[PDB]
Amino acid sequence: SDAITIRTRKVISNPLLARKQFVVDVLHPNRANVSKDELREKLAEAYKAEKDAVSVFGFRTQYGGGKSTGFGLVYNSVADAKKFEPAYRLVRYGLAEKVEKASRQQRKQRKNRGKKIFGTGKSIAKKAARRNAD
Amino acid sequence: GKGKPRGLNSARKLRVHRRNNRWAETTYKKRLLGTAFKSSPFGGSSHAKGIVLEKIGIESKQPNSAIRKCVRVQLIKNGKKVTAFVPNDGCLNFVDENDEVLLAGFGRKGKAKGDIPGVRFKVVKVSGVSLLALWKEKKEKPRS
Amino acid sequence: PRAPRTYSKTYSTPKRPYESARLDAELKLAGEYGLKNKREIYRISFQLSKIRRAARDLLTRDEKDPKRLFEGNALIRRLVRIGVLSEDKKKLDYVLALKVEDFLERRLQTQVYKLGLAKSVHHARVLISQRHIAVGKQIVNIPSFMVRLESEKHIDFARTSPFGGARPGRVARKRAAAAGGE
Amino acid sequence: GKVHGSLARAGKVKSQTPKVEKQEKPKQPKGRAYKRLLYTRRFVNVTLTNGKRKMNPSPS
RNA sequence: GGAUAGUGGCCUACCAUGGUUUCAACGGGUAACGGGGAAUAAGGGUUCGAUUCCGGAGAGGGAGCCUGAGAAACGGCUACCACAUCCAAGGAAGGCAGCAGGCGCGCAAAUUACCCAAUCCUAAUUCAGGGAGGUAGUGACAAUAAAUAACGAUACAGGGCCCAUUCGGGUCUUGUAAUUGGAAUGAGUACAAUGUAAAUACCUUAACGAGGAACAACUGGAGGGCAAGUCUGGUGCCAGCAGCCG
Ligand SMILES: [Mg+2]
Ligand SMILES: [Mg+2]
Ligand SMILES: [Mg+2]
Ligand SMILES: [Mg+2]
Ligand SMILES: [Mg+2]
Ligand SMILES: [Mg+2]
Ligand SMILES: [Mg+2]
Ligand SMILES: [Mg+2]
Ligand SMILES: [Mg+2]
Ligand SMILES: [Mg+2]
Ligand SMILES: [Mg+2]
Ligand SMILES: [Mg+2]
Ligand SMILES: [Mg+2]
Ligand SMILES: [Mg+2]
Ligand SMILES: [Mg+2]
Ligand SMILES: [Mg+2]
Ligand SMILES: [Mg+2]
Ligand SMILES: [Mg+2]
Ligand SMILES: [Mg+2]
Ligand SMILES: [Mg+2]
Ligand SMILES: [Mg+2]
Ligand SMILES: [Mg+2]
């Protein structure tokens, strides 16, 4: 009596982005939300596409449980999904990796520190070293 | 038929007559002259802090025989000195000498209320804490 | 700076706060329909007053005037859709004759009481507040809800609720577990 | 004598009043229940129809 | 004529002696930025509008200027005044009415937080950047919906009563009792998943989570105005209350 059933309303093709856009209306009684990865797979074999060229987001389980609604897209190829989707969706789905970024404050600190020096700092480092030498 | 002019081109004198008559009111004259900012102990201020100078009680009027327990407070914002009234049974002892006290209006539009002569200000807070919390022993004076 | 969205008051406390007859009538209406506060009657009176200001303004306008037609029949269709104004008196002159009790009557509280699934008005209030009644498969935990004519036929206990058919709940499940264990 | 102690002692009456403790006071229903209780007590359990309603009728 | 990008006493040279004003000119005050608007509401109006949008002005007060298409710019320079900083006493460097935060002031107002996800903007231009902005933190400024119990079975009762042999069954119902039962449910915690740039939080939901359901609602008032006591004790024109009468 689980029978998670899925529907794609307002589906529009879009070769401008080589995609198919729709709103995901998922009916699921006696159950919590649909755990996106599982519904991505469901749309994958629903539209005859790989689990990589399918994306869902913006979900909202309506008041009182049961129905839930989100937005979904099906890309023509996995490469197009790679080259068109935002980085954070490619991180959610495991097809990309979080970029090793320093925090914003440290980046700004380093930007100002680079501002302090005109040109490469190769000369000034040795100059200062031999300066405090004497 | 009436003192005011009635012609269709008599807007000027009607307007200036109303403008000259408006000064007969007290609220309008106070608002336009700005007497509250210049002469009142607070300038358009509902509340004001101050420092207790001494600890006096004033007798009441004729039909009411008692001594209301007030306190003389020098205002910190400008330096004026005003008497203020501590409102409750056992709140005089709560306020001590030379402590910051937050005075408020007395509720009668800056005029003496009831039988208490020459006072126009309540006492709401003492030393950062309120009188009402002290009177019901909900908070205690920090004694600093 | 982002464009604000306008909050607005929805009630208006009366001028004379200690009218004996008015206070007794307010308590009568609060006890008849299980209203939590007397702000509820103020809110219904404010809604009635807005409707009534619109009605009188449209009445002032001349008969067979586009504003009169359009907005008057819009207001009448909205009120008959709500259900407070009976189909007999769609005239915009009986719309002034509506009373606060009429809008009180269309509350989901009183509707659940009328249908009989709640045998008491306060029982209707709690049953609504416990997420049991669903107006067309949609759970409504809100007593007023201004139940409309077209959807009153679809009030029943929700499927997720034990009354509509589900697991009983905390007390009964715990007692069943205790009985099974001992 | 004329005055038992020093006069005008900044809270004399409050100081010398007997401190009487609160009663145990079983919980009073609150919210919609209070309004239901008032409605029952006034408009379906009419007690003293003679004279006025006389809510809080002092015993004498 | 000069200058202006250009008209123009905008400036200069020479002339004329003119221009505004009781329809309030000029001067003074504004705890005055103007407006779209806000509160208030029979109609007419009164007050407010520093602030989410449009304009104007300002970057401590003043003046002066380079670069450019656009600045009299100030997170651009020059100098004076005021206020200051490091100092090896020769010198050097200042501009929060930007986002944070601090001192002071005052009755009076927030975290040195996350990030470019969304709105956009700048650039050589997708990609870089953006305290613009969004997200969270505090937040009872205001605004919306709304929990704090609901229903039985019993004892103490009240009204429509079959009549009225006193009755009285309670025949028909409605309350009051520390009696007494079975239910439902959140406020909280919390597997998860959704949410989000990542997280909270909300919507959903496992597993817990109500008996004095201590998971305990206060704030004011009870002479009148004004709804509710001429109950009990205390003080005795004291203490105090009282917006006014008292
Ligand atoms: Mg005396
Ligand atoms: Mg100014
Ligand atoms: Mg403005
Ligand atoms: Mg203004
Ligand atoms: Mg100002
Ligand atoms: Mg602006
Ligand atoms: Mg400027
Ligand atoms: Mg400054
Ligand atoms: Mg340029
Ligand atoms: Mg400048
Ligand atoms: Mg700056
Ligand atoms: Mg700037
Ligand atoms: Mg510079
Ligand atoms: Mg700041
Ligand atoms: Mg900002
Ligand atoms: Mg504040
Ligand atoms: Mg908080
Ligand atoms: Mg509580
Ligand atoms: Mg009380
Ligand atoms: Mg009192
Ligand atoms: Mg009393
Ligand atoms: Mg009365």
Compact description:
This is part of a larger assembly, with chains A (134 residues), B (144 residues), C (182 residues) and D (60 residues). Chain A has helices spanning 37-46, 78-84, 87-92, 104-116, 122-133; strands at residues 5-14, 19-27, 54-61, 67-75.
Write down the domain tally of chain D. Answer: 1
Query: How would you characterize the largest beta sheet of chain D?
Result: none
Helix/strand-derived category of chain A reads alpha+beta
Order of helices and strands of chain D: HH
What is the count of β-strands of chain D? 0
Q: Note the overall shape of chain A.
A: elongated
Head-to-tail CA distance between termini of chain A: 85 Å
Q: Hey, which two chains have the biggest interface? A: C-D, 12 and 10 residues
Approximately how much helix is present in the residues of chain A?
25-40%
Largest sheet of chain A: 4 strands, antiparallel
Write down the CATH class of chain A. Alpha Beta
* Distinct small molecules: magnesium ion
Strand residues, percent of chain A:
25-35%
GO molecular function (chain D): structural constituent of ribosome
Keywords (chain D): Ribonucleoprotein, Ribosomal protein
Protein name (chain D): 40S ribosomal protein S30
Family (chain D): Belongs to the eukaryotic ribosomal protein eS30 family.
Describe the structure in your own words.
The structure is cut from a larger assembly and holds chains A (134 residues), B (144 residues), C (182 residues) and D (60 residues). Chain A is α+β, with helices and mostly antiparallel strands and 134 residues long. Chain A has five helices and four strands. In chain A, strand 3 (54-61) and strand 4 form a beta hairpin. Chain B has one domain (1-144). In chain B, strands 1, 2, 3, 4, 5, 6 and 7 form a seven-stranded antiparallel sheet that branches. In chain B, a hairpin with a 7-residue loop joins strand 2 (57-59) and strand 3 (67-75). The radius of gyration of chain B is 22 Å and the shape is elongated. Helix content of chain C is 51%, strand content 3%. Chain C has helices at residues 20-33, 39-60, 66-82, 100-105, 108-115, 121-129, 162-165, 170-181; strands at residues 133-135, 155-157. Chain C has a two-stranded antiparallel sheet with strand order 1-2. Chain D contains two helices and no strands. The B-D interface holds B 57, 67, 69, 89-93 and D 8, 10-11, 13-15. One magnesium ion (MG) is lined by residues 59, 67 of chain B. The structure holds one RNA strand of 246 nucleotides. Chain D: It comes from Kluyveromyces lactis (strain ATCC 8585 / CBS 2359 / DSM 70799 / NBRC 1267 / NRRL Y-1140 / WM37) (Yeast). Chain D: Keywords: Ribonucleoprotein, Ribosomal protein. Chain D: Residues 1-34 are annotated as: Disordered.
